[PDB]
Amino acid sequence: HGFVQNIVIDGKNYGGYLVNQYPYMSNPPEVIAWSTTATDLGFVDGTGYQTPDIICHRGAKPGALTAPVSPGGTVELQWTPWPDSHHGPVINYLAPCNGDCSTVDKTQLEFFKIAESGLINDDNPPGIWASDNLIAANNSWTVTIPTTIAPGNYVLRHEIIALHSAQNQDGAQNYPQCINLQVTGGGSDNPAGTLGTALYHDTDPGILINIYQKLSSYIIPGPPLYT
Ligand SMILES: [Cu+2]
What we know:
Number of strands: 13
Name: GH61 isozyme A
PDB class: hydrolase
Number of domains: 1
CATH architecture: Distorted Sandwich
Number of helices: 2
Keywords: hydrolase, degradation of biomass
Assembly: monomeric
Bound molecules: copper (II) ion
Shape: globular
CATH class: Mainly Beta
CATH topology: Coagulation Factor XIII, Chain A, domain 1
Entry title: Thermoascus GH61 isozyme A
Largest sheet: 7 strands, mixed
Structural class: mainly beta
Distance between the termini: 31 Å
Helix content: under 10%
């Protein structure tokens, strides 16, 4: 359980959508992060993979603001403290807004995967995962925006999938957090995207899985990494 509370880009902080404050206040600030209704600090499990909730989390609406990113620049997402027990991959996607991200129809966003990290070491099951790397970095993840993609406005969909309960159907816990970015530079690729509701299924080999056994490999879920 947790959420993204801060985003560092080009030497400044952009405040995140504080889901344990803003849903209660009257009334909340504009930020680059999408609003959600996930005030339980919770997740979208397999029962919601083919619903709009999986796109940018439960009841999500676009952030009002968009943060520019230098060409090939980094975006550092800072989470509330992530539980060690909540082992799993950390995955990053971009979807073009083809306009102002603040007015997009989230159900039409076509995401392409720009980074993925999964099972790092399995010397001691359930092992060390991307989420553990995130914890070790003081609850932080650094995403590098590709220099090869068409500049424009994009939604970054940043996500941890916790697998500690994934042995049973619909047991995996997805924690997507979306923010709005302005990608800059001289790239030209428009990578093939995937609708949010088509990213995952509750029987994927990296979703329906027993992480407590010895694993020789791990298939990170979602569409192929863009390279
Ligand atoms: Cu949790």
